[PDB]
Write a structure and sequence with these properties.
Three copies of one chain form a homotrimer. By secondary structure, chain A is mainly α. In chain A, 43% of the residues lie in helices and 5% in strands. Chain A has a single domain (1-154), classed as Orthogonal Bundle (Lysozyme), CATH 1.10.530.10. Chain A has six helices and two strands. In chain A, helix 1 (6-18) crosses helix 6 and helix 2 (71-81) packs across helix 3 (88-101). Chain A is globular and about 40 Å long. Chains A, B, C: Its main location: host cell. Chains A, B, C: This is Endolysin.
Chain lengths: 154, 154, 154
Amino acid sequence: MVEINNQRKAFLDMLAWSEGTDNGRQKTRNHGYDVIVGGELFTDYSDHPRKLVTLNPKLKSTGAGRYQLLSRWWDAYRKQLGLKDFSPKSQDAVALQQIKERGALPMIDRGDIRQAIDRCSNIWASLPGAGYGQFEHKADSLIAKFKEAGGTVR
Amino acid sequence: MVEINNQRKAFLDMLAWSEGTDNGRQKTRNHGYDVIVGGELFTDYSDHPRKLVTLNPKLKSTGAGRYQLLSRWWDAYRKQLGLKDFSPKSQDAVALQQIKERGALPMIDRGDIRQAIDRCSNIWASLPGAGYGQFEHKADSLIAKFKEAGGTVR
Amino acid sequence: MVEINNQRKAFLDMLAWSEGTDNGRQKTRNHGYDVIVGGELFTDYSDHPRKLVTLNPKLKSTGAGRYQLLSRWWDAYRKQLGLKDFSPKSQDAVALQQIKERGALPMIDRGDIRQAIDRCSNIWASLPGAGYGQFEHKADSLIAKFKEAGGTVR
């Protein structure tokens, strides 16, 4: 399993905030860990809710959990990591594993958050990529949230 | 909010032992309720001491009290539960609230401690499977401690 | 300057189409190489036009050229690659350099376009990231364009 440390935890909190699952606005009984794309909540943590939500006549998504994990990616990782449920710890595990695969861990650990965000933009829709126009602006908000979660930026 | 019963009290004692705040070795004048991460003690219970013992980004911690509650979580819960101080009763309240949120209360009440421990590993670093670089007690030692605190296991 | 080959050329054409600079509808006198974000054209190729265009209150951008390169990245790469102008050749050079830095060149050369697109999504806003809700469908329309530009997919 990818180890959790203060920098990584702060990154996961920034991410939960960015994705809108744990931002003090969206309703939740457990820090966004029970949020289904669209805003509904689930209570059974034995598996991904797998509820297909139509966000509009031309947009569907199965994102669920604190990091809005798609069901197809959940299946891949649950098998790969040997996870027995979709509990908060399992959700953190998958997110960290995806961050690991993108080579972002060293960046997070050392405080190069702007780079970590860019590297992870291909996984999470709320994160901007560096070539996009609004990056500098969005990264400031993200960096601020990262800092208040206790992370240290370089 | 969350009322205390024998099973829950036994869980909190097991937790204090696990976290190293109340284990008969760590110094304390009040059963671990005055312990700051690192081992120093505080005497003013009107608020979380809000101290760290390292500036190392990965290792940084503000844990304080019997259950080593981080200051950022303290602020969230203080507001949410309407707590006026960081007294032992307030500390117990926050811990029980976090346990309630991870869906572990029914598990504790019925004696399914191994499951409750797993669900709570996402909150406390000493609980087996937590995934930090810290020492994690074996489930067996935890269950033994839970039983000597008067809890009944199924 | 990174070398151009048929696979790479086809990727740059797919990209110009995806970004809307060279798609048969947007006006241009030079295959999108003269397009400023928003749709205006420039004629002086000695430097990036450097116009900050407001697309809406929340979205501003300085993208210009066939691949909609932001001015700040233009300055970085101009210096790094020793470019003396913002001519079509220079624009291609920077795009290829960015693709090289994302490790997508081998993917493009071998025909693994879906992977290359995902790796490059952090640079270009029109490209989809793999964790995105509709990756497979958007990738399909891009692959079609890549193939008609003469590229071979695996």
